[PDB]
């Protein structure tokens, strides 16, 4: 065929593409199947085609984004805005609504607009990756550090707008977000916070501004195209130390979480964001499945014990990092060794104590936790051939028995659909993100379908136990919004009413987070 | 004359009140001149009458709130929701729009719904004062501590909904707000975050839920009536120590702020929210103006010197608190002494070192910063007869020169309108609230008119320098919103579209933060 926006003829789409070319330059409008292939989900879900873009437009300026949005309103073209488009696990760059035009802001709006060393912040355009920001801070001998997710090729801005997270004390990216500039769905531009007071220098010093705080309405959202975003940057501490605790039993998870909470809730001695990764997650970072089990179905217990023995890891591996003067590091590490020492079999290693293959993960977290971006986690996709992943991430109370129950519910479905269960518990002050990566052969349509069906059952199963996900893939967005339905869907009704108010023609990423504007509500897609 | 809602007849109002009576009980609907006098602004601003309530309704439950809002929609009666209604300095309980009915949620909805010791949170109704919650924590041998403003008789919820602040590490109340329940302007009820997932234990554990993050839109806002709100509660540390640094010269302000920033930006050694108060603010807390000066206008230099000598305080007095094991306190306090000691005339005191009258402020801060509510600061209102105050609170970069120019700018105008300039800088990580309390004789019409015209001038002057206010009085909300006018007022136009979409009848607190629903837009008020 040719992929087209819903309701839009071949003819009117050709016209609108030429309007875009007049705004951005012919170079920067892609509309052919060979050109669009790189903007498909690199980790596709389900057997069938889905989430197909009709074109890709790369603007160079806030002004060009306005003009793009005006043209889109004139023609009823839907727009999916991305920064770097690296949302792998949740859809890649692909739109939720098939036929949408991707607006890749970060291809050319990729400039670092300010890094302020005195007050510790940055003012960024969407194309700035973590690597770009790191090389800038290194170049200018900065005293600041950034906060990055596991992979460095994403966007500081784009990750924030999906409320992603990293692992330093500044790991809640949306919390340290300060000021943004946004083009609203009919082309008007707006600045939040002290940016709305012209001549203020405090756009990136004071988040709230005056009046209703709106910045949160542009995260996991479709109320506009963000063109600038500010973010706080932490001073680098004078030293740091990273550590691993290996735990032998699957059932250790309960005592691990329970001892952790008192050590974490006051942000000391667990100063950073700890991660609790199972042996499958760690083995996937350093080895192929076939090294351990070349056979059929779920991995047997003896192969698991071989994994743990060969890598000298446990079933549960705790990674953390301490910052500050060396005496403060010694004391805190002492408190952490005494507390988790009560769990029989716990073994402790610093980042200076492990140079084997099993310690490759520890060395990678020691980078990530010190604001040094990395791609070594890509090695996880070599667990199986042509590997891809989807993120199933329920929220869990920092309680041992609730975690244990989430672990068991998920592994039981994992086995049923013949998929390994790799887990990374990402631990905040009072909440945990229970990251379930399902790694699968993207060239196998049967595997792709099992992944769709399995995660659709897990969304439902988790919700029936009172567990929701914080973030999800294009293919699960409707399902996941449907679980947040207290008061006969009051939350969704709220978002719809606001969407239709700011977006009367229904242009911006329809269906993002399950939020469709009037003209699409009631169809399949 | 009877105070009536705009456009509502005497007969339609009387029917509407009776319907209110059928919902909450006849006891809980005040409407006579005598019953209303107590709900007028206790610190009135300007000579003229303004902000008059037409009635006060006191609901017992969320369901009654819903019914109140439905009746209001049917009769076009505007509703000013408040919790305890002690927003003194900003209007008290008085509505922005005269003729509004106050919905005082806190009078009967005053119950603590949950205090969770393990995860450290509260779930509260709007009527829970800081004293009430402190009493609960004391009776239950709680290991938690709250965070309170200077006056403990206000609402934890209400203060949060105006983005008020306290002085412990949890001093940013909105940040630690986690979950709320709200009756939207047409009577439907909604829960944010994990509260939207039926059966989740995580409403007060994970703030964001899924999809766009809305809770900020209900702060300093008129998009609904809030009926429940959660907030995180910090663990009480094993020890604390408060301290006072006195600085001799007016001109020291610049050096105090510039030495302060590097000790504050990493939240250590300045772990709490330091305040920097001037000698008038400290004298007003412990003495009357006439103890220093009886006569003509601004206070002369000899008299200021008498206050400093008699109270053993400086012109600028810096108050902080340290928390933790005594080794840590001592380390941090040694760092604070070594840095600020570089300013000639700096003098240092811990809370155990001063039992004189000048030390009463230090001892009050020592309570506040340890989560112990107080009404001692009410004494500042005895500076002059029939004392009242208004909060003019521009935001400042944490920069000595910026602080100095704000100080000079406000003092010049204070002099010009024959008022004393009481200052309390409230110091965040990257920003300062420059609290300018103007204390005045509320019974004197010319004094009230001076307050109105001086602060009108100050809003305009500050914004011409690139400064805005974080919070303001009823009388200044249109002037302050008007300064945030980047891109031809994009911010206010964004808020009005949301306002008109969730409040089609224009019911909830019209004019709050200068946001007026369409049916009032264009008129005087
Ligand atoms: C092995 C692996 C590990 C991972 N680890 C982590 C981790 O530790 N933490 C984590 O957070 N994620 C993690 N992820 C997920 C993903 O890699 C990152 O979150 C990634 O940074 C998101 O993609 P991005 O930065 O390119 O954002 P984008 O793809 O550019 O944006 C994501 C979404 O935000 C919205 N958006 C983006 N830009 C705009 C804009 N200008 N205007 C409006 N809306 C916009 C759109 O909805 C878009 O689809 C991991 C993924 C994998 C496969
Ligand atoms: C001497 C002095 C010192 C002060 N110090 C401080 C200080 O340190 N910190 C500080 O923050 N303030 C301070 N203030 C300001 C004020 O006294 C307090 O902030 C006070 O706690 C606010 O009043 P309240 O808690 O009763 O809230 P309320 O008056 O009950 O509510 C405040 C506002 O929030 C909104 N609101 C409240 N409840 C609801 C609801 N249920 N639904 C919808 N909207 C709602 C309304 O717009 C309402 O007017 C001070 C004032 C004085 C005079
Ligand atoms: C903490 O959030 C995430 C962490 C991770 C961590 C992956 C490491 O195996 C992945 C994600 O999406 C695919 C996330 O959203
Ligand atoms: C920090 O916020 C405020 C502090 C204060 C502190 C007053 C102490 O004199 C007052 C306010 O409004 C009147 C505030 O909004
Ligand atoms: Ca338990
Ligand atoms: Ca009923
Ligand atoms: Ca300076």
Numbering used by the authors:
A (entry chain D), B (entry chain A): 2 to 526
Tell me, in the authors' exact words, what the paper reports:
On these grounds, we identified the same enzyme, EUGO from Rhodococcus jostii RHA1, as a promising candidate biocatalyst for the efficient and selective dehydrogenation of dihydrosinapyl alcohol into sinapyl alcohol. To understand the effects of the introduced mutations in the EUGO8X and EUGO10X, their crystal structures were solved at 2.3 and 1.6 Å resolution, respectively.
The mutations identified from the initial screen, L381Q, S394A, S394V, I427A, and I427V were next individually incorporated into a thermostable variant of EUGO (EUGO S81H A423M H434Y I445D S518P, referred to hereafter as EUGO5X; Tm of 80 °C) that was obtained previously using the FRESCO algorithm. Despite this, however, the EUGO5X triple mutant was still not a perfect dihydrosinapyl alcohol dehydrogenase. Both catalysts contain five stabilizing mutations (S81H, A423M, H434Y, I445D, and S518P), as well as S394V, which have already been discussed in our previous engineering study of EUGO for the dehydrogenation of 4-propylguaiacol. L381Q meanwhile forms a new hydrogen bond with the hydroxy group of the substrate side chain, thereby forming a specific substrate–protein interaction. The combined effect of these mutations rationalizes the enhanced activity of the mutant toward dihydrosinapyl alcohol. By superposing the substrate-bound structures of EUGO8X and EUGO10X, a subtle ∼20° rotation of the plane of the aromatic ring and concomitant shift in the position of the propanol side chain of dihydrosinapyl alcohol can be observed.
